Amino acid sequence: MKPLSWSEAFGKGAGRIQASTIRELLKLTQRPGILSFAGGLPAPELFPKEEAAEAAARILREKGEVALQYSPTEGYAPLRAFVAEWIGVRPEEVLITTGSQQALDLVGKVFLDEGSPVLLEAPSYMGAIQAFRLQGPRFLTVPAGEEGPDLDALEEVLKRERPRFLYLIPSFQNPTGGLTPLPARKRLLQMVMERGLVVVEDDAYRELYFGEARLPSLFELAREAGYPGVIYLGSFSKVLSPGLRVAFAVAHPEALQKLVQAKQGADLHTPMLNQMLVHELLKEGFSERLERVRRVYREKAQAMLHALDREVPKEVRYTRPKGGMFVWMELPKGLSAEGLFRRALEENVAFVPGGPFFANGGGENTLRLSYATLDREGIAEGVRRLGRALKGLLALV
């Protein structure tokens, strides 16, 4: 017989398919005894388990025939309505998705072809890179700094290339924590409007602001200006339950129709029980829930910064968050994050090495830390161990 060799049987796509270190690391971090600063896993004590149990049961008893049946792709109507009210659009402009990860998959399918340019920050969210990579695009990057993307570098890229879209996370970027301030958002919008460019705005961390208010999204600025080119991505993952896999894409009807049709082939539709459950949980008390979310992450972030300031040598650089889940660390004198990873893990501490957040490589001396999962005690202890680990490595470079 002719042998079957898998490497041979695979299409060219398969070579662009690689594991996510974030996804893989969860197998390690969910194990008892690990102090995790790895994945952006929401604080478990914010899970409304009792309320979820009541809501799920009522949905299934009274609306079982709907929760358990096939449903149209666009989403459970009341959820589309609720998202529409919150974001300030019409329901028919909302698509419910299977996590914002799916929306990333969908936008890559709709806009990217082999060799097509796509613009994102270096570093940016590895899951977006992973999703877009499948299409075989050319990644164009600009540095991400404490004030979001380098707009001068962006202006230079735009003189040379026409990206299929710009993928951005203006509000507490994954992984740097950067917040793009209002003037830069307006400058960005101007650059995109002048060139009629598409922006995919990933707003996973929208509500996790630590300060008095949130900044207007690029989507809200675009809507004010009457510009139709911002595709807006939001998620219930960081505010309620990541495991429910319920999120949304809001877009111009032409773009949304393509995202809908791509979704039909991706999974038919997002599980109906899950969408119903989100809507039942959020339809009353959402602002109050969001206030608590903000406080819980603000306190964790404060504990995180207090411990880093005390335990980490001053030669090591790290960002200070104004929101979201992450601190971004840069190691000096050529230290490897993978080296540090090894040491820390021996001390039961996990983080994410920064390398794979760089779509074109580099960043071997960087790492992302999440303060979302651990309580204050665990944050302090975990950072003490990391600090110990760094000093040992710094001693021996």
Ligand X SMILES: Cc1ncc(COP(=O)(O)O)c(CN[C@@H](CCC(=O)O)C(=O)O)c1O
Q: Does 189 bind a second copy (CB under 8 A)?
A: no
CB of 66 to ligand X, least distance (A): 13
Contacts of 256 (CB under 8 A, 6+ apart): 93, 95, 249, 250
310: partner contacted, choices ligand X, a second copy, none (Cβ within 5-8 A by kind): none
Q: What gap in Å lies between CA 376 and CA 331, rounded to an integer?
A: 24
Interaction mask 56-95, a second copy, x per CB under 8 A: xxx-xx--xxxxxxxxxx----------------------
Helices assigned H by DSSP within 30-146: 49-67, 77-87, 100-111, 126-133
Q: Is 371 annotated as a binding residue?
A: no
CB 242 within 8 A of CB 293: no
The entry of a second copy, ligand X, none that residue 213 binds, CB within 5 to 8 Å by partner kind: none
Q: Does 102 bind a second copy (CB under 8 A)?
A: yes
Which of the choices ligand X, a second copy, none does residue 182 contact, using the CB cut-off of 5 to 8 A by kind? none
Residue 188, SS3? helix
Looking at 3-11, 171-179, 205-213, 287-295, which segment touches a second copy (CB under 8 A)?
Answer: 3-11
Q: In this chain, which residue has its C-beta nearest to ligand X?
A: 99
49 near a second copy, judged by CB under 8 A: yes
Binding footprint of a second copy, residue count (CB under 8 A): 101
Pairing of strands 230-235, 366-370: unpaired
SS3 label, residue 150: coil
Nearest to 125 by CA among 164, 168, 96, 154: 168
Residues lying near ligand X in the complex (CB under 6 A) are found at 22-23, 26, 39-40, 70, 99-101, 125, 127, 169, 174, 202, 204, 235, 237, 242, 247, 268
Q: What kind and span of H or E run contains 35?
A: strand 35-36
Pick the closer one to ligand X by CB: 94 or 393. 94
Q: Is 209 annotated as a binding residue?
A: no
Q: Which does 125 bind (CB under 5 to 8 A by kind): a second copy, ligand X, none?
A: ligand X
Contacts of 59 (CB under 8 A, 6+ apart): 67, 273, 276, 277, 280
Q: Is 135 in the site for a second copy (CB under 8 A)?
A: yes
CB 242 within 8 A of CB 47: no
The smaller minimum CB distance to ligand X, of residues 180 and 235, is found at: 235
Work out the angle between the directed axes of helices 182-195 and 151-160 (0-180°, nearest 10): 10
Q: Is 232 annotated as a binding residue?
A: no
Least distance between ligand X and beta carbon 282 (Å):
15
Q: Which residues of 342-371 are buried (b: 16+ CB within 10 A; e: fewer)?
A: ebbeeeebbbbbbbbbbbeeebbbbbbbbb
Rounded distance, CA 145 to CA 324, Å?
16
Closest distance to a second copy from the beta carbon of 214 (Å): 24
Nearer to ligand X (CB atom), residue 101 or residue 135: 101
Task: Name the minimum Å distance from CB 172 to ligand X.
Answer: 9
Q: Which does 174 bind (CB under 5 to 8 A by kind): ligand X, a second copy, none?
A: ligand X
Token pair, residue 331, equals 């190691």
For residues 42 and 137, which CB has a smaller minimum distance to ligand X in the complex?
42
The answer to whether 289 is annotated as binding is no
318 versus 357: smaller Cβ distance to ligand X = 357
- The residue type of 175 is P
Q: Does 195 bind a second copy (CB under 8 A)?
A: yes
Annotation-wise, does 150 bind a ligand? no
CA distances from 108 to 12, 103, 112, 130 (A): 17, 8, 5, 10
Q: What is the CA radius of gyration of the chain?
A: 21
The binding site for substrate comprises: 40, 174, 368
The binding site comprises: 40, 70, 100-101, 174, 202-205, 235-237, 245, 368
The binding site for pyridoxal 5'-phosphate comprises: 70, 100-101, 174, 202-205, 235-237, 245
